[PDB]
Every structure is written in C-alpha cells, then in structure tokens.
Amino acid sequence: QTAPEVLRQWQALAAEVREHQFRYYVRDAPIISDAEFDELLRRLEALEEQHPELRTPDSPTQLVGGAGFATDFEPVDHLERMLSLDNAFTADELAAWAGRIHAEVGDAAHYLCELKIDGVALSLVYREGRLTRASTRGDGRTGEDVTLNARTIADVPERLTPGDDYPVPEVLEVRGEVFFRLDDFQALNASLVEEGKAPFANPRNSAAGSLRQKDPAVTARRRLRMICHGLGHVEGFRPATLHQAYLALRAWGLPVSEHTTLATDLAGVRERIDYWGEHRHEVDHEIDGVVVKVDEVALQRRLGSTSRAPRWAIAYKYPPE
Numbered sequence: 649q650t651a652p653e654v655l656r657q658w659q660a661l662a663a664e665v666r667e668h669q670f671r672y673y674v675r676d677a678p679i680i681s682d683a684e685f686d687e688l689l690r691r692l693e694a695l696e697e698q699h700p701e702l703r704t705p706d707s708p709t710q711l712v713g714g715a716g717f718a719t720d721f722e723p724v725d726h727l728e729r730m731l732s733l734d735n736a737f738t739a740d741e742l743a744a745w746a747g748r749i750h751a752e753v754g755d756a757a758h759y760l761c762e763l764k765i766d767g768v769a770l771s772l773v774y775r776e777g778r779l780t781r782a783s784t785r786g787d788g789r790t791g792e793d794v795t796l797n798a799r800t801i802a803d804v805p806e807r808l809t810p811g812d813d814y815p816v817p818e819v820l821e822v823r824g825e826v827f828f829r830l831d832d833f834q835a836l837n838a839s840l841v842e843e844g845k846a847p848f849a850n851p852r853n854s855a856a857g858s859l860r861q862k863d864p865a866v867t868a869r870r871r872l873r874m875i876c877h878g879l880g881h882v883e884g885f886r887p888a889t890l891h892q893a894y895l896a897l898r899a900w901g902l903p904v905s906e907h908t909t910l911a912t913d914l915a916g917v918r919e920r921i922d923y924w925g926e927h928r929h930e931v932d933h934e935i936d937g938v939v940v941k942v943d944e945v946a947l948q949r950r951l952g953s954t955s956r957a958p959r960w961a962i963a964y965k966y967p968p969e
C-alpha cells in the first residue's frame with residue numbers, strides 16, 4: 649500500500665478502536681462484541697508493526713485498558729458567542745419588552761415560548777455529523793472542554809441521523825441544558841450517602857458536579873439528561889425560524905422539549921406564562937420560567953444583541969416560592 653493510504657487506514661482504524669475503548673471502558677456499554685474488538689486491535693497493531701513511525705504514546709495501541717480518558721476543562725472557544733438572557737419578573741416588564749419589539753419590527757414577529765430549565769448550559773459542536781466538542785458556557789466566548797463527559801450522556805448522540813428532508817450540516821453548534829430528573833436527583837443522593845459522600849443540595853448543583861468530572865466514567869454512571877434549546881454557528885443549514893430548526897434537530901436525533909409552543913403576539917405569550925405558572929410542578933425536572941423568543945431568524949438579526957444579551961429574547965422567571 650502507498651503512504652497516503654497507510655496514513656488514511658491508520659487514522660480510521662485508530663479512531664474506530666479508540667471509540668470502542670471509550671464505549672467499553674468509560675460508558676460500560678460496548679456496541680460490538682469483544683471478538684470484533686480484538687480483531688480490530690490486532691489489525692491496528694499489525695499496521696503499526698510495518699510502520700513504527702505510526703506508533704506514538706498517543707496511539708490507542710499504547711492506551712489500553714481504559715487509560716488516557718481524562719477531562720481537564722481546558723478552555724475552548726465557542727464558534728458564536730453564547731450569551732445569557734435578559735430577565736422579566738412582572739407582567740409590566742414583559743409587556744415593555746414586547747412593546748420595544750413591536751416598535752422595531754411590528755406584527756411580523758411571532759413568539760416561540762419554551763420552558764426554561766434550571767440546569768447547566770452546554771454547547772455541542774458536530775462536524776460532518778459527528779460530535780467533536782462539548783463545552784460549558786464560561787464567559788460566553790470561551791468555555792471549559794467537557795467533551796468526554798458529554799459523550800456519556802444518553803440523550804447526546806455521537807452521530808447525527810441522516811434524512812433527505814434535513815441534510816446533516818457540515819458544522820452544527822447546538823446549545824442546550826443538562827439536568828437531572830427529580831427522582832434521579834434523590835436516588836443519586838441516596839447512593840452518594842451510602843458511599844460516605846456528601847449529598848447535593850439541589851438538582852442543578854448535582855448536574856453541574858456530575859458533568860464536571862475529571863474521570864468521565866463517573867459521569868457515565870449518572871443519569872444526566874439534556875434538551876437542546878438553541879443554535880449557534882451553523883454551516884449547511886439555513887432555517888427560516890427557530891421552530892423549524894427544532895424540526896431538523898429532531899430529525900437528526902437531538903433531544904428537544906415537547907412543551908414549546910408558537911404564539912402570535914403578547915396575549916398568546918401571557919397565556920403560556922399563566923399556564924406554566926400553574927402547571928410547571930408537573931414536569932419531572934425543574935422549570936423556573938418561560939423563555940420568549942422572536943421566532944423569525946431574519947428578525948433576530950435585525951434586532952441584534954447587546955454585549956451581554958440578545959434583544960430578541962427574554963426569560964420570564966417565576967417568583968421563587
């Protein structure tokens with residue numbers, strides 16, 4: 649075989665082997681038989697026999713038994729800045745935001761209403777349909793690399809599902825929230841106490857702590873969930889509206905909430921706020937408000953963002969008990 653083909657074959661076989669090492673050792677959830685894996689590793693070691701320049705301390709052949717999977721939280725840039733949200737706590741504040749929106753873009757704006765989860769923000773990047781990076785918010789330009797931890801989350805697919813309706817983008821940065829269900833928060837605290845560790849005081853702290861683990865195998869043992877609620881940088885995907893982008897996220901296998909609705913104007917927004925004020929306790933994870941977003945992407949650009957926040961979105965937060 650020629651040297652280009654040698655380097656091609658090595659990279660592909662090293663990556664396939666490393667992925668199964670991760671799934672077996674960190675996730676404890678292999679997806680091929682031990683017999684299959686053993687053939688893979690033999691072929692890889694054979695190929696490194698011929699070409700010993702390919703054998704590095706970094707090779708999966710040198711990182712056997714689960715070695716070499718540690719998270720170090722190194723800073724990593726978001727592709728597009730990941731801002732926080734301005735908040736509204738009163739009917740008046742929300743109407744004021746609604747008025748400013750109308751005065752700038754008129755009735756052409758409609759309002760996506762989503763449930764606000766009290767969890768830990770996570771930004772995922774997929775390149776050519778494969779997960780390459782996951783990071784915390786950090787300061788909005790730069791977050792901490794927790795890629796390996798996120799790869800253990802059951803709701804986070806490693807690969808996006810192709811479909812002719814919605815082609816897999818070349819690059820997709822998708823934002824979302826990690827959290828625990830209430831029943832799993834309690835069960836994890838019981839487990840922790842049984843081992844002599846302190847329980848967590850709330851499910852948010854518990855999710856953050858469970859995600860931010862130097863050894864991702866700890867994260868893999870915990871029932872972290874995720875729900876996508878936003879788009880950063882995308883290439884090869886130009887959705888006209890946020891609600892239509894959720895259709896593509898679903899088609900690709902990414903988790904989305906079933907409690908999002910599309911409203912026409914402020915009266916429709918107020919009804920969803922009133923409704924979830926009465927029923928949010930029925931959701932099996934923590935909801936602390938309702939995020940109202942202008943749905944039309946073109947109008948999102950026109951209205952822009954400030955240094956710290958989008959002008960086309962507001963979080964209505966409920967008063968704490």
Ligand SMILES: Nc1ncnc2c1ncn2[C@@H]1O[C@H](COP(=O)(O)O)[C@@H](O)[C@H]1O
Nearest residue numbers: 731732733762763764765825877939963
């Ligand atoms: N459904 C959602 N849509 C957008 N952002 C959300 C959502 N849920 C949580 N967040 C993030 O949660 C933060 C809201 O701040 P907080 O008042 O502390 O709830 C925002 O900065 C968001 O980026």
Ligand SMILES: NC(=O)c1ccc[n+]([C@@H]2O[C@H](COP(=O)(O)O)[C@@H](O)[C@H]2O)c1
Nearest residue numbers: 668669672678679680681682683685686
């Ligand atoms: N099924 C898999 O994906 C997978 C991956 C990595 C290691 N393994 C198994 O782990 C073990 C390697 O450890 P020993 O070869 O030291 O037993 C073998 O059983 C190997 O097959 C399995």
